[PDB]
Amino acid sequence: KEIEITVGYHSDDETIFKGVVIRQNLKIRNNQSILIVESRDMAVKMTLRRKSKYFYELSDSDILEELISNHGL
């Protein structure tokens, strides 16, 4: 799911973070019980799979744009 966090003083809020929910953790102790939720930005898509490719007559910045656009970023 997609998550967005806003914060401010006296309801003058502004956006701090945008991203996607990845993990859910529970913790129980003698007099405590909580839920912890973790999220990351969309860039996380670029860290999941090993690849192999030949590139041709490109500058480094053409390559950097290609790697990013492949994940819809």
Partner 1 sequence: SEGKLEKLRIVAYKDSKFSDEVENGEFITLLNPEKYKFQYRVEQNEDQASGTSSAP
State the residues that interact with partner 1 by CB under 8 A. 31-33
Record the tokens describing residue 45, joined without a space: 């898509």
**Minimal distance in Å, beta carbon 26 to partner 1?**
15
For the bound state, the minimum distance from the C-beta of residue 31 to partner 1, rounded and expressed in Å, comes to 6
Nearest to 51 by CA among 71, 28, 37, 33: 71
Residue 37 CB, nearest distance to partner 1 (Å)? 14
68: left (phi over 0), alpha (psi -120 to 50) or beta: alpha
- Closer CB to partner 1, residue 32 or residue 61? 32
